Design a protein around this ligand. Structure first.
Ligand SMILES: *C(=O)[C@](NC(=O)Cc1cccs1)(OC)[C@@H]1N=C(C(=O)O)C(=C)CS1
Ligand SMILES: [Cl-]
Length: 245
């Protein structure tokens, strides 16, 4: 059961408007239909970078590295570039502000053996954790494409990943990004800088009253000045398709 990714190059106007290039992939859950502006880049695999916080949190929770979304992970004292990293954090706040050292410690505690076994169970990307156990999603060998992200998120939404239902619900809670009377967005941003090409990520889904639209976008990010375009371009596509007002 798969009809195919229906191409819609109309969305490229939003990329060129902001002098950007990239891909947006949408998936209508109720109708089982996928749509993208660039079928090739939709299957192009990249480093997941901070979007790896979704599987990392799941494993850490299911193994007991993280007890719940309230456990405090104390700042190790090292002053870092991002100001919000230099405080204590919980799972909600570590995901919101994308606190790498918190998740690097998660990976070290998970272990290379369990990280590989768990990502194979998740069917996540190329399932290659080669590199440092606490940095392989930043400069190692793991690659995931936008369509593979949607595939992974769909299983997470339906509690179908091979971790406990509780772990999956906690992560989906920590993914909450926006909510109003019209929609709910559960998503994770991402930014890959070490290995070329430099790209920005945004993967997640839009919850409506009677449907859910999964999305996974990436775009060339030569400078950090356009990080806001990850969400801005994604929403412009969502508004054009009448998914959000
Ligand atoms: C996750 O993507 C994030 N990105 C970076 O720190 C960029 C890199 C540094 C070394 C290799 S990639 O941490 C891994 C966080 N990402 C975001 C985001 O937009 O999601 C941030 C703005 C904070 S750093
Ligand atoms: Cl929630």
């Amino acid at each position: 059961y798969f009809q195919g990714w229906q191409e819609n190059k109309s969305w490229n106007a939003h990329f060129t408007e902001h002098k950007s290039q990239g891909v947006v992939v949408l998936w209508n859950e109720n109708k089982q239909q996928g749509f993208t502006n660039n079928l090739k880049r939709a299957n192009q695999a990249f480093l997941p970078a901070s979007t790896f916080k979704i599987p990392n949190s799941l494993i850490a929770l299911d193994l007991g590295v993280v007890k719940d979304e309230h456990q405090v992970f104390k700042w190790d004292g090292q002053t870092r570039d991002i100001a919000t990293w230099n405080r204590d954090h919980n799972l909600i706040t570590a995901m919101k502000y994308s606190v790498v050292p918190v998740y690097q410690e998660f990976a070290r505690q998970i272990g290379e053996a369990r990280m590989s076994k768990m990502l194979h169970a998740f069917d996540y990307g190329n399932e290659d954790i080669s590199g440092n156990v606490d940095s392989f999603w930043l400069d190692g060998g793991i690659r995931i494409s936008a369509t593979e992200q949607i595939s992974f998120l769909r299983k997470l939404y339906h509690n179908k990943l091979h971790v406990s239902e509780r772990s999956q619900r906690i992560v989906k809670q920590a993914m909450l990004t926006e909510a109003n009377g019209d929609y709910i967005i559960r998503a994770k941003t991402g930014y890959s800088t070490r290995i070329e090409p430099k790209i920005g990520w945004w993967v997640g889904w839009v919850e409506l009253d009677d449907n859910v639209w999964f999305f996974a976008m990436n775009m060339d990010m030569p400078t950090s000045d356009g990080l806001g375009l990850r969400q801005a371009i994604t929403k412009e596509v969502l508004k054009q398709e009448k998914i959000i007002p």
